[PDB]
């Protein structure tokens, strides 16, 4: 449910993601057919005032009944080529996140653990 102007607690090893700023990062737009951004899609991201695409991985809102959920809006950056700009994500990530058909493998290995 990553809607417009949503702040996201990005979990990644990217320096700009790690960079403190005047504000924490917030999204601007998402790659969704509806205006509703769920986990597993491309969203905007402001890193030190820099627009960048990212993938929202792990949300807080209630989704499917059997699935797990964190308490925030976790996300991992993506490059203009689509590759992960950062190195690793400390928080474990849900295994069903790859089951969305699309770009999944490049983030499927880089994080520390699997939730």
């Amino acid at each position: 449910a990553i809607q417009k102007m949503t702040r996201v607690r990005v979990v990644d090893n990217s320096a700009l993601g790690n960079s403190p700023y005047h504000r924490a990062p917030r999204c601007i737009h998402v790659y969704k057919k509806n205006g509703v951004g769920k986990v597993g899609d491309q969203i905007l991201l402001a890193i030190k005032g820099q627009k960048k695409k990212a993938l929202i991985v792990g949300h807080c809102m209630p989704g499917p009944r059997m699935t797990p959920r964190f308490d925030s809006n976790n996300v991992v950056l993506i490059e203009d080529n689509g590759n992960p700009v950062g190195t690793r994500i400390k928080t474990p990530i849900p295994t069903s996140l790859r089951k969305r058909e699309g770009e999944y493998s490049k983030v499927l290995a880089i994080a520390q653990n699997f939730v």
Partner: protein
């Protein structure tokens, strides 16, 4: 064998239409690169299917990203390329391989509600003239042995070549320059016999052979009674007739780097004075008279030199053939 006129399309710009960001692609350029006979080894000279285009730009909309870049187009030729444009004159003037000529047009954008302009992709009118089928068109005489002469004067076996024309592809023969490189010459289409010797394998093919900018007049350098023709048309008489036809066809072409091929030199030897006769026919005004100061019956006196075929002796015949090939490729 003919001249080609193509339209070159370059890169096209992209789109949007995001509130943040902007346009996409740019416009590429048109490059012309001439390559050796190895380009003709892959059959891409009978290609013509109304030219070729290039890539276009991108937009991106998730979430505020701009687009890609454009694409340039390179037009290759099988053997040699002379590049001209729609201005009525050629900028690049060469036919040797590894020569490139570029035409630039680009700088693309996108329409109106973030960062502005209207357009589409770019194009140019290119004209490729190969200066005959490969390097020059050979018009012989009724003693012609140009295929055997080229085979005897070069260690490279002749192959089949093509050109970007609306007609049939003439046969080409490889010549050796004795410099770790090889040049190419072109003959009559189909079965090579010589244009003057009543054969062109077609009337339209004869017109295509006669439309060559650089012509080589093959004739018997030996004696008329010793020529491999019955009845021979005499070396002096047929040579004078062919040279007069070639010179009167165009005075500029006579003053250009055109040559006459010395053939039937496999019977002749070093002491047969075939090279001496070739020099006496090349340095003169293609007649009995050698030099004319003021009163000259021809358009220009002291014309260009003659090319050697079926090479013999060691008085620089290979060097003369290499220089003739270089002058033909110079255009």
């Amino acid at each position: 064998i003919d001249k080609l006129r193509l339209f070159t399309r370059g890169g096209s710009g992209g789109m949007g239409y995001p509130r943040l960001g902007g346009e996409g692609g740019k416009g590429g350029d048109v490059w012309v690169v001439a390559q050796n006979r190895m380009t003709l080894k892959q059959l891409k000279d009978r290609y013509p299917r109304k030219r070729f285009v290039a890539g276009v730009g991108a937009n991106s909309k998730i979430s505020a990203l701009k687009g890609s870049k454009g694409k340039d187009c390179e037009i290759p030729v099988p053997v040699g390329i002379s590049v001209t444009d729609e201005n009525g004159k050629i900028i690049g003037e060469l036919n040797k391989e590894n020569d490139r000529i570029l035409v630039a047009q680009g700088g693309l954008g996108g329409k109106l509600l973030t960062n502005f302009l209207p357009l589409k992709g770019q194009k140019r009118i290119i004209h490729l003239d190969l200066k005959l089928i490969a390097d020059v068109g050979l018009v012989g005489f009724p003693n012609a042995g140009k295929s055997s002469l080229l085979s005897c004067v070069s260690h490279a076996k002749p192959a089949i070549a093509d050109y970007a024309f609306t007609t049939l592809k003439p046969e080409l023969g490889k010549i050796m320059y004795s410099d770790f490189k090889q040049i190419s010459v072109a003959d009559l289409p189909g079965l090579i016999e010589g244009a003057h010797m009543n054969k062109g394998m077609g009337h339209k093919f004869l017109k295509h052979i006669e439309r060559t900018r650089q012509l080589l007049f093959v004739v018997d350098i030996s004696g008329f009674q010793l020529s491999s023709h019955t009845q021979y048309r005499t070396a002096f008489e047929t040579i004078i007739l062919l040279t007069k036809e070639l010179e009167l066809y165009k005075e500029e072409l006579q003053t250009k780097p055109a040559l006459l091929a010395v053939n039937k030199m496999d019977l002749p030897d070093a002491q047969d004075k075939f090279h001496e006769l070739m020099s006496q026919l090349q340095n003169p005004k293609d007649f009995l008279h050698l030099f004319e100061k003021n009163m000259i019956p021809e358009r220009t006196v002291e014309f260009q030199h003659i090319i050697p075929i079926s090479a013999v002796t060691g008085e620089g015949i290979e060097e003369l053939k290499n220089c003739i090939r270089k002058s033909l490729d110079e255009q």
